[PDB]
Design a protein around this ligand. Sequence first.
Ligand SMILES: *[C@@H]1O[C@H](CO)[C@@H](O[C@@H]2O[C@H](CO)[C@@H](O)[C@H](O)[C@H]2NC(C)=O)[C@H](O)[C@H]1NC(C)=O
Ligand SMILES: *[C@@H]1O[C@H](CO)[C@@H](O[C@@H]2O[C@H](CO)[C@@H](O)[C@H](O)[C@H]2NC(C)=O)[C@H](O)[C@H]1NC(C)=O
Ligand SMILES: *[C@@H]1O[C@H](CO)[C@@H](O[C@@H]2O[C@H](CO)[C@@H](O)[C@H](O)[C@H]2NC(C)=O)[C@H](O)[C@H]1NC(C)=O
Ligand SMILES: *[C@@H]1O[C@H](CO)[C@@H](O[C@@H]2O[C@H](CO)[C@@H](O)[C@H](O)[C@H]2NC(C)=O)[C@H](O)[C@H]1NC(C)=O
Ligand SMILES: *[C@@H]1O[C@H](CO)[C@@H](O[C@@H]2O[C@H](CO)[C@@H](O)[C@H](O)[C@H]2NC(C)=O)[C@H](O)[C@H]1NC(C)=O
Ligand SMILES: *[C@@H]1O[C@H](CO)[C@@H](O)[C@H](O)[C@H]1NC(C)=O
Ligand SMILES: *[C@@H]1O[C@H](CO)[C@@H](O)[C@H](O)[C@H]1NC(C)=O
Ligand SMILES: *[C@@H]1O[C@H](CO)[C@@H](O)[C@H](O)[C@H]1NC(C)=O
Ligand SMILES: *[C@@H]1O[C@H](CO)[C@@H](O)[C@H](O)[C@H]1NC(C)=O
Ligand SMILES: *[C@@H]1O[C@H](CO)[C@@H](O)[C@H](O)[C@H]1NC(C)=O
Lengths: 49, 366, 234
Amino acid sequence: NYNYLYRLFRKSNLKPFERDISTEIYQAGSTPCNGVKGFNCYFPLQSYG
Amino acid sequence: KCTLKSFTVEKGIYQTSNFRVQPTESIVRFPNITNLCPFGEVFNATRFASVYAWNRKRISNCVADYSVLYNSASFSTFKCYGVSPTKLNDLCFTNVYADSFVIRGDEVRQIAPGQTGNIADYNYKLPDDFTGCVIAWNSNNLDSKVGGNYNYLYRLFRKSNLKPFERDISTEIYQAGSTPCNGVKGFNCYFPLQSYGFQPTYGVGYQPYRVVVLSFELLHAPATVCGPKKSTNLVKNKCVNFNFNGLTGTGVLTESNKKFLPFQQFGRDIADTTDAVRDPQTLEILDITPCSFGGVSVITPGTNTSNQVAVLYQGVNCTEVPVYSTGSNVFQTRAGCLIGAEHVNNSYECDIPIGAGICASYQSII
Amino acid sequence: QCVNFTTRTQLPPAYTNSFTRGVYYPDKVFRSSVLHSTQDLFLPFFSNVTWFHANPVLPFNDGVYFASTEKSNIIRGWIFGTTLDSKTQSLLIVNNATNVVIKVCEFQFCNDPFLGVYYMESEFRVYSSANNCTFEYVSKNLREFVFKNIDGYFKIYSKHTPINLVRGLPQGFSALEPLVDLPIGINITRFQTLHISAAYYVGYLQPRTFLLKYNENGTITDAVDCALDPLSET
Ligand SMILES: *[C@@H]1O[C@H](CO)[C@@H](O[C@@H]2O[C@H](CO)[C@@H](O)[C@H](O)[C@H]2NC(C)=O)[C@H](O)[C@H]1NC(C)=O
Ligand SMILES: *[C@@H]1O[C@H](CO)[C@@H](O[C@@H]2O[C@H](CO)[C@@H](O)[C@H](O)[C@H]2NC(C)=O)[C@H](O)[C@H]1NC(C)=O
Ligand SMILES: *[C@@H]1O[C@H](CO)[C@@H](O[C@@H]2O[C@H](CO)[C@@H](O)[C@H](O)[C@H]2NC(C)=O)[C@H](O)[C@H]1NC(C)=O
Ligand SMILES: *[C@@H]1O[C@H](CO)[C@@H](O[C@@H]2O[C@H](CO)[C@@H](O)[C@H](O)[C@H]2NC(C)=O)[C@H](O)[C@H]1NC(C)=O
Ligand SMILES: *[C@@H]1O[C@H](CO)[C@@H](O[C@@H]2O[C@H](CO)[C@@H](O)[C@H](O)[C@H]2NC(C)=O)[C@H](O)[C@H]1NC(C)=O
Ligand SMILES: *[C@@H]1O[C@H](CO)[C@@H](O)[C@H](O)[C@H]1NC(C)=O
Ligand SMILES: *[C@@H]1O[C@H](CO)[C@@H](O)[C@H](O)[C@H]1NC(C)=O
Ligand SMILES: *[C@@H]1O[C@H](CO)[C@@H](O)[C@H](O)[C@H]1NC(C)=O
Ligand SMILES: *[C@@H]1O[C@H](CO)[C@@H](O)[C@H](O)[C@H]1NC(C)=O
Ligand SMILES: *[C@@H]1O[C@H](CO)[C@@H](O)[C@H](O)[C@H]1NC(C)=O
């Protein structure tokens, strides 16, 4: 089932009892993303196998 | 009124709170970066060994900047498994193992925990608990030969698999059947080693690919290998907080004429309190002084009489006062700094003692 | 490339007094005109020191104080380890005019290890083989050294002094500066001394308490052993 999803990348930590559903690209590396993953950018949310 | 927890205040002087000069900025200094690990000779080697004879290198007691490996875009595959790479510059282990070889394009995915294949079972096996990173990049222009580069050999047949971190280069004739062979192939005997056929004309997935795997070890010996620590500029005559080579604390830094023997790093006077420190970069003796702090007091002639007060800062020079920053004529005394009361040059009896032989009273407040 | 020898020279060791020698800087902290009491491993005042005039395998214990009143840089090398073979990691140190060179792995030593001088010196036959290792480090007169091994750290303190007395140790005070530190963890219980082609004093260290005086320039000028006699304890 691929209906289960969880974030694995974020800029920082979360405050207690706080929920974030921002589906934005992550600039893991120094290369800017500009809306395109390419290299050094990945989708922060990954599904359950 | 809040401190006294009452709505009326009689004439006198009361201590309300205390103040201290806040730090302005932060500075961190570290010795000059040197003793970098020799990463160039590994990722820019003339050639790599075979996959069944993967080359092993040990890295210890050197600073390793992984940022240069991260920001390079020439690496087609850069997969770090155990931890997120961005924090290897902060946390680190005591040893590094580098395994270098050349494999086919389709075999790139096989270099991962929980993966199977010819290489993953007969050439190099990685445990499911493996931590580290793998870097695979194309080397078609170098390893592949127009006439067919057979210099790379891979194991094809073996009775059992390979244990984690085990290297086997045995050339024993594999005996699939029950007929023994005395070093010569036959009906059921085949050579386990096969040479690669890398060529420039080969398509995607067949071109040679150089792979280097970095593994981190944390034996009980002290950790020595990880990224450099950045340094900032130096400021003086300002109460700031500093992190000189692990010595952390706040204060104001001035120049000092004290002499240190060439083997010390910092000094103290008594009761184990830091007094002077030497910067690890320019090697000069600075001086640390705790920036000013002190209690405050309010002088009032009584709520019933008037509603104006004077503020006294105890033992604080009249140079760093900070809504009552100007008030009235500011008077500097041995006891401290007085604000809101004018200074006269007469002499009467003492009403509200202040200190150092002076005191104030209500006429305004004098 | 070494063989046995026939001139089995064995001079029995004599005994001498220690007086007030064997004091080093315990840390890297500057202190000016202050009396500081510290508990650490030192050589007790007025102890027994084993004078040697071949060289035996002396146990290392916790630490070693090694002195040599030699002429024109005779004492050269040092060997440390537990088994001194290829079974367990061994440590070798060679002192030169500039500094000391250190190697840490299993060199295979023979009965008579020596450096050898050719008359322009070119000779090295202390061992025979060394398979795997990582750590190599390169940087009339009485030379004093203190060797310590504390929680995975090898410390060497050194000092050189000019003396004219012949028979015994000088009756003076001189603190020992810290010289070399190694972040290597290897068990060592025994040590030796390299021959040349020669008298030295050996003493052991014990944990105790000392009182040290720092003058206006951060140099130690006086030391007192607390547990020696009632006056010192007072
Ligand atoms: C292998 O060699 C390449 C080429 O010299 C190195 O890539 C260079 O890295 C420096 C780092 O300061 C850059 O300034 C250059 O622009 C890079 N050149 C190219 C063509 O990419 C690479 O860093 C070397 N690998 C290692 C591990 O040192
Ligand atoms: C550590 O600090 C710097 C690091 O570069 C060096 O010292 C100065 O460096 C600047 C520029 O690099 C030179 O213009 C100066 O002449 C250097 N001064 C000295 C005294 O060398 C050097 O690598 C190290 N300096 C010290 C004092 O250890
Ligand atoms: C308060 O600070 C001022 C400086 O902001 C001090 O004035 C200095 O005093 C020193 C020593 O007396 C002199 O060498 C300087 O020339 C003075 N500078 C100026 C601009 O006057 C003042 O002495 C401090 N007050 C107290 C009580 O310490
Ligand atoms: C040569 O390399 C081997 C393998 O790394 C070393 O073996 C290590 O020995 C230490 C001794 O305490 C152990 O703690 C390590 O676990 C060993 N390594 C492995 C992978 O098991 C050996 O010491 C090195 N030097 C030689 C053989 O002289
Ligand atoms: C501490 O060190 C200072 C700085 O070297 C010494 O001061 C000089 O010392 C030299 C030789 O020791 C003398 O020739 C100079 O006349 C000294 N000058 C001054 C202004 O003192 C000092 O003697 C050392 N010892 C003490 C106790 O301060
Ligand atoms: C304030 O002072 C006046 C004059 O002495 C007096 O009449 C009055 O009672 C006082 N009030 C209080 C609250 O002390
Ligand atoms: C303080 O003394 C000076 C010295 O001449 C004098 O001019 C001044 O009037 C005095 N202050 C007062 C409030 O009288
Ligand atoms: C060392 O001990 C021996 C006997 O064991 C003794 O004769 C000698 O005087 C001692 N050395 C001293 C006390 O300096
Ligand atoms: C001692 O060894 C060092 C390091 O190899 C060398 O630079 C120095 O010249 C040597 N001293 C001699 C040979 O006297
Ligand atoms: C030293 O010996 C102790 C006791 O057997 C052992 O725990 C330790 O691992 C040894 N260390 C080295 C470096 O041999």
